[PDB]
Design a protein around this ligand. Sequence first.
Ligand SMILES: COc1cccc(OCC(=O)Nc2ccc(-c3nc4ccccc4s3)cc2)c1
Ligand SMILES: COc1cccc(OCC(=O)Nc2ccc(-c3nc4ccccc4s3)cc2)c1
Ligand SMILES: [N+]
Ligand SMILES: [N+]
Lengths: 188, 188
Amino acid sequence: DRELAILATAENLLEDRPLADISVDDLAKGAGISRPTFYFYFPSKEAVLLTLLDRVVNQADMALQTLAENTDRENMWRTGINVFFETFGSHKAVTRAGQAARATSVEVAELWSTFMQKWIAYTAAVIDAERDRGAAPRTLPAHELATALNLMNERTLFASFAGEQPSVPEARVLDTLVHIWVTSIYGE
Amino acid sequence: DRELAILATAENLLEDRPLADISVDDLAKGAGISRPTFYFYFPSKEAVLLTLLDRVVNQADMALQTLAENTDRENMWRTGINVFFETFGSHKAVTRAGQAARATSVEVAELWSTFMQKWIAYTAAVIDAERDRGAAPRTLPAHELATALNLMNERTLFASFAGEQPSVPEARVLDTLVHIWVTSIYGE
Ligand SMILES: COc1cccc(OCC(=O)Nc2ccc(-c3nc4ccccc4s3)cc2)c1
Ligand SMILES: COc1cccc(OCC(=O)Nc2ccc(-c3nc4ccccc4s3)cc2)c1
Ligand SMILES: [N+]
Ligand SMILES: [N+]
């Protein structure tokens, strides 16, 4: 919880500016500790972002697990995509920074990669179940369809949350993604 | 065409390694010229990448214009998405580097942004035409559906071309994207 202070301060500062405009001394100051005391909890400012990102991706992941262990088909996909929209949506600054650091950082890249593989494998399993019960047609291989849908969400939510041009406005992005998932999963 | 030599050399070196592992002296050497002679044609190695990216995006754009000024609906979308797949697919190293430099470079960011807005506006116009002729249903706003489909293609092609994990294998990515465009455009 000097640790938690450092994490909270880094998330607050990331609202204002990028990681590379945040100094260790910045983080230390905000957390009420000295610089060498900072280095006791974290090896670097990049390690702090990694930890923040790790907690955010694990929060989406635990929320999706919760949903899984339990409405119409459209509403089912909408409630699952909404886990990602609300979770990353509630941590935009960390989302944007972890987005950027995937270039910068092999560790940020592998964390992102492991969780995307997990969410894709879970989307493919649900598509397969829908196909085994006769509710969805056997069109594309489920895992390939899942990979594209998941990558679409990653890129489109990142764009909306960053205010990119072009982007879907944040107020319309959930409905946009759900329409594309549902038509592509159930459509022939 | 000392200019063209510098452009060709930079595209060849980008096959081996990132821009930040390529030196001006590298580019100059490959192009058969001195360093100050290099600085006569380009202000920096970043300006060379910008130019390479500019020619690649304009090539996709002119190819899509060609198609536009002229088969079943599935095949129509497939031939248009294929412009992007073949054009960026034929220039992977430049594609990957321009992908990365969007973070690094406001100019790379604006070039990418201008062309994505243009391709989205064109996809929305064709969707609207399909809806005006009664061939597609009026579901999502055409421009929002176009923005998500185009962002999906950008992210999914970049992943396939980079060999990312996760990605759709390059041999399956065109069919994957076309299925999602067609079901989402024509589906209710
Ligand atoms: C920055 O934004 C990002 C970054 C990375 C991923 C992302 O979206 C993934 C996603 O929405 N995938 C997804 C959505 C829903 C489901 C599921 N929803 C349900 C609902 C009921 C039962 C099983 C499931 S499985 C699975 C994966 C968004
Ligand atoms: C690195 O990979 C990238 C990077 C950026 C964009 C991208 O894909 C955009 C795309 O496929 N959009 C697209 C596809 C097709 C069409 C069209 N296809 C036809 C076909 C006939 C008539 C009109 C049209 S309009 C419009 C936009 C791929
Ligand atoms: N949100
Ligand atoms: N290609």
